[PDB]
């Protein structure tokens, strides 16, 4: 259950390489989870991704989880009057 901040940092870099916001993605209470699921990966073959080792599978799972959370957490700003009003999509 040893924390692995390197894995979550690699996931951070992979996210910000293309795009990522991740509001509540703090290294605390997440590095420990990554480490314990790495422990679960180890000493339990038969479910690792093909052609990639335990750490890479862990960071890929973190990729999927962070992408899902960021996709779920999307909001739209409400403007002053309206976004579809004809006064907006025009010269002004």
């Amino acid at each position: 259950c040893a924390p692995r901040p390197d894995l979550v940092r690699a996931a951070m870099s992979a996210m910000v390489r293309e795009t990522g916001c991740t509001p509540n993605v703090n290294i605390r209470e997440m590095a420990i989870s990554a480490g314990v699921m790495l422990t679960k990966i180890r000493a339990n073959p038969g479910m690792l991704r093909y052609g990639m080792t335990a750490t890479q599978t862990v960071i890929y799972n973190l990729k999927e989880l962070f992408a899902a959370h960021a996709a779920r957490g999307v909001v739209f700003k409400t403007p002053a009057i309206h976004p579809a009003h004809p006064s907006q999509w025009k010269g002004f």
Binding site: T19, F76, K77, P83, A84, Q88, W89, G91
Partner: protein
Amino acid sequence: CTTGAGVTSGFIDLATYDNLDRALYGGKDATTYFIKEHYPVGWFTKLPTMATRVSGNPAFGQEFSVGVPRSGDYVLNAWLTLKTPEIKLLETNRLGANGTVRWTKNLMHNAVEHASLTFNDICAQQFNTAYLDAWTQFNMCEGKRIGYDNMIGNTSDMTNPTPAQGQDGARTLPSKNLVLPLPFFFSRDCGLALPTVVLPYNEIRINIKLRSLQELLVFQNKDTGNVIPISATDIAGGLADTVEAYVYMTVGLVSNVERCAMAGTVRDMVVEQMQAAPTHIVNPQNTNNVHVDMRFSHAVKALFFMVQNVTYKSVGSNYTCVTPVNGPGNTVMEPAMSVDPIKSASLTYENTTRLANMGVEYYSLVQPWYFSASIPVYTGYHMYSYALNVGSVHPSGSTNYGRLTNASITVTMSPESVVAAAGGGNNNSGYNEPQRFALVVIAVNHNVIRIMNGSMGFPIL
């Protein structure tokens, strides 16, 4: 004589090499076939879905609207299905024995007009019968022609005249459902689709107005070739104003990472619309040259102009000088004297003849052969395109009419048209009664749609 023997002549073929071959082939950076590069694509899925009803009622002569459900990332395809009623001509019809009933040619592109797509409460696109006919007759891909003539009608069963019950041919018109794909900007190409996941502020609506069933059925006189409007008592079972119809759409779903990446951004989309000029009544008896002004706004890409015979509202999608009449074998017959009423046409830009008095066969054949995917197989359907490829979604040569002050288009009639305008035709000649003609002009233009703050809009208005 199975004396097949060659394995070595390839060596001679490769040995043949000179300056021209060195210039064309060869080189260290030259690409080679038999080796295809693989690049991954996005992970997605698609499936049909039912379009939820929001208002109106499906019936002939009325207009109803259907909303677009907000449950998928992209909406990119729409079609309308409609179940035709049963037609059974009785022996008590007004025409008596000399009376046949048959569905009008091109049953689809009829029973529908002013088909519109509106976002929120602002109209974004609108098309109708003339645009549908011109499109399907000009940029149609081969191989699907039989399929389309099965979906829309003209299946040699709806258009075959059926005599009364007392006659030898008492066959009733079958009640089989038909389908019409709705051509929209997102349906034009896969690259253009509606980002419903990004657009929660706008309510997408599709408004369809069905034509009245009175003029949909064609009531023809077998002998004299006369047409009179149908009535409820004419056919068995009366006339059913209501009809069962549905609208279906295809929705695509993408991965969560892709939608997360694309959320919160501004995108510019280029779309194609149409503008329909008001119809003009043409009387070849009085004058032979008819000039009409064209008023358009955006970058016009093509101009489709036809002259439609409008003697009877029952017959539709007819662009000849003589209405079709019944023939032998209970089949529609095309009278011999039937040619396109247009003889020549020209375009004028404020007393500046851009296009001279070119022949009608020019617009009929030469222009489609060079700047379209197909050549029409029916009389009429004249076009002029400013672009190299009309069907291509990517922009090509075009001229914006906003800056160009109002231009005019002039057409010349034909001796066949001016002789069919008056009556005097014998039986089953189509032009027995005086004929009337109307000019219709359709334009196709480009436009730009911008996405800002989760709502689509026009940056140019």
